[PDB]
Write a protein that holds these residues in place. Structure first.
Motif, PDB file in Angstrom:
ATOM      1  N   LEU A  45      39.583   3.538   8.164  1.00 52.41           N
ATOM      2  CA  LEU A  45      39.725   4.391   9.331  1.00 52.41           C
ATOM      3  C   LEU A  45      40.599   5.584   8.995  1.00 52.41           C
ATOM      4  O   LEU A  45      41.645   5.437   8.365  1.00 52.41           O
ATOM      5  CB  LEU A  45      40.344   3.628  10.502  1.00 52.41           C
ATOM      6  N   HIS A  46      40.171   6.758   9.418  1.00 49.24           N
ATOM      7  CA  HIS A  46      40.882   7.980   9.094  1.00 49.24           C
ATOM      8  C   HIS A  46      41.430   8.653  10.340  1.00 49.24           C
ATOM      9  O   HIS A  46      40.819   8.607  11.405  1.00 49.24           O
ATOM     10  CB  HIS A  46      39.963   8.954   8.352  1.00 49.24           C
ATOM     11  N   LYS A  47      42.601   9.248  10.191  1.00 45.91           N
ATOM     12  CA  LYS A  47      43.144  10.147  11.194  1.00 45.91           C
ATOM     13  C   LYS A  47      42.718  11.573  10.853  1.00 45.91           C
ATOM     14  O   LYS A  47      43.234  12.176   9.910  1.00 45.91           O
ATOM     15  CB  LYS A  47      44.674  10.044  11.243  1.00 45.91           C
ATOM     16  N   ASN A  59      43.523  10.721   4.890  1.00 49.17           N
ATOM     17  CA  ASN A  59      44.321   9.997   5.865  1.00 49.17           C
ATOM     18  C   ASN A  59      43.656   8.681   6.202  1.00 49.17           C
ATOM     19  O   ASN A  59      42.634   8.657   6.877  1.00 49.17           O
ATOM     20  CB  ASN A  59      44.517  10.803   7.147  1.00 49.17           C
ATOM     21  N   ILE A  61      44.301   4.852   7.854  1.00 49.04           N
ATOM     22  CA  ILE A  61      45.190   4.059   8.682  1.00 49.04           C
ATOM     23  C   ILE A  61      44.895   2.577   8.486  1.00 49.04           C
ATOM     24  O   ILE A  61      45.785   1.787   8.178  1.00 49.04           O
ATOM     25  CB  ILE A  61      45.029   4.419  10.174  1.00 49.04           C
ATOM     26  N   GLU A  62      43.627   2.228   8.626  1.00 49.94           N
ATOM     27  CA  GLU A  62      43.170   0.852   8.492  1.00 49.94           C
ATOM     28  C   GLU A  62      42.058   0.809   7.460  1.00 49.94           C
ATOM     29  O   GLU A  62      41.403   1.824   7.225  1.00 49.94           O
ATOM     30  CB  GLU A  62      42.642   0.328   9.829  1.00 49.94           C
ATOM     31  N   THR A  79      39.669  -1.685  14.521  1.00 50.00           N
ATOM     32  CA  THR A  79      41.055  -1.479  14.164  1.00 50.00           C
ATOM     33  C   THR A  79      41.874  -2.702  14.561  1.00 50.00           C
ATOM     34  O   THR A  79      41.604  -3.336  15.584  1.00 50.00           O
ATOM     35  CB  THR A  79      41.621  -0.213  14.839  1.00 50.00           C
ATOM     36  N   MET A  83      45.656   1.947  19.027  1.00 53.50           N
ATOM     37  CA  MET A  83      46.377   3.029  18.369  1.00 53.50           C
ATOM     38  C   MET A  83      46.862   4.117  19.314  1.00 53.50           C
ATOM     39  O   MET A  83      46.421   4.234  20.459  1.00 53.50           O
ATOM     40  CB  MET A  83      45.505   3.646  17.287  1.00 53.50           C
ATOM     41  N   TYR A  88      40.141   9.893  15.371  1.00 55.25           N
ATOM     42  CA  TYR A  88      39.856   8.858  14.389  1.00 55.25           C
ATOM     43  C   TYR A  88      38.373   8.794  14.069  1.00 55.25           C
ATOM     44  O   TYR A  88      37.539   9.249  14.850  1.00 55.25           O
ATOM     45  CB  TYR A  88      40.321   7.489  14.895  1.00 55.25           C
ATOM     46  N   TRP A 107      30.144   8.628   7.918  1.00 52.05           N
ATOM     47  CA  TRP A 107      31.200   8.756   8.906  1.00 52.05           C
ATOM     48  C   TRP A 107      30.734   8.295  10.274  1.00 52.05           C
ATOM     49  O   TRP A 107      29.622   8.605  10.700  1.00 52.05           O
ATOM     50  CB  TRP A 107      31.668  10.210   9.037  1.00 52.05           C
ATOM     51  N   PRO A 110      33.648  11.329  15.181  1.00 52.51           N
ATOM     52  CA  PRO A 110      35.076  11.319  15.487  1.00 52.51           C
ATOM     53  C   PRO A 110      35.357  11.061  16.963  1.00 52.51           C
ATOM     54  O   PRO A 110      35.020  11.873  17.831  1.00 52.51           O
ATOM     55  CB  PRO A 110      35.547  12.719  15.080  1.00 52.51           C
ATOM     56  N   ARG A 112      38.139  10.451  19.957  1.00 52.07           N
ATOM     57  CA  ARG A 112      39.473  10.938  20.234  1.00 52.07           C
ATOM     58  C   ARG A 112      40.138  10.087  21.297  1.00 52.07           C
ATOM     59  O   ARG A 112      39.592   9.894  22.383  1.00 52.07           O
ATOM     60  CB  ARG A 112      39.411  12.396  20.692  1.00 52.07           C
TER      61      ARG A 112
END
Length: 118
Positions: A45-47, A59, A61-62, A79, A83, A88, A107, A110, A112
């Motif tokens: 998982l990306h920020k 980035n 996160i998980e 996740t 969060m 993400y 991907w 995204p 939010r």
């Protein structure tokens, strides 16, 4: 390609905009013909700093392996915690061990999560 090569994120967290939520994000991977058999798909998982641009790595996160079988031909990743606000997305790139070259990344769009009393 091979047996397990066609896992696709077919479903995912449907916030899709400015939504204020404490929530655990998820993505569902369906094997559209090429069943998960050999190993497990790797996800992270990306920020993301921006959701209107092509999502980028760096980035995380998980992360882990998909594994979770929510249906006979349906897998799920979530996740491990609910969060804080931010942008993400899930970056899955084929079975673990597979060289990430030749556009092997997929991907999740995204999503939010916001937290604002405004």
């Amino acid at each position: 390609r091979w047996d397990q090569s066609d896992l696709h994120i077919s479903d995912q967290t449907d916030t899709k905009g400015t939504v204020c939520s404490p929530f655990a994000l998820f993505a569902v991977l369906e094997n559209t013909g090429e069943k998960l058999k050999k190993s497990k798909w790797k996800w992270e998982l990306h920020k993301l700093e921006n959701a209107r641009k092509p999502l980028k790595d760096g980035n995380v996160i998980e992360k882990g392996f998909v594994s979770n079988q929510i249906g006979d031909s349906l897998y799920k990743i979530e996740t491990k915690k609910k969060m804080k606000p931010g942008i993400y997305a899930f970056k899955v790139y084929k079975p673990a061990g597979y060289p990430a070259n030749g556009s092997t990344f997929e991907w999740s769009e995204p999503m939010r999560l916001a937290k604002c009393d405004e």
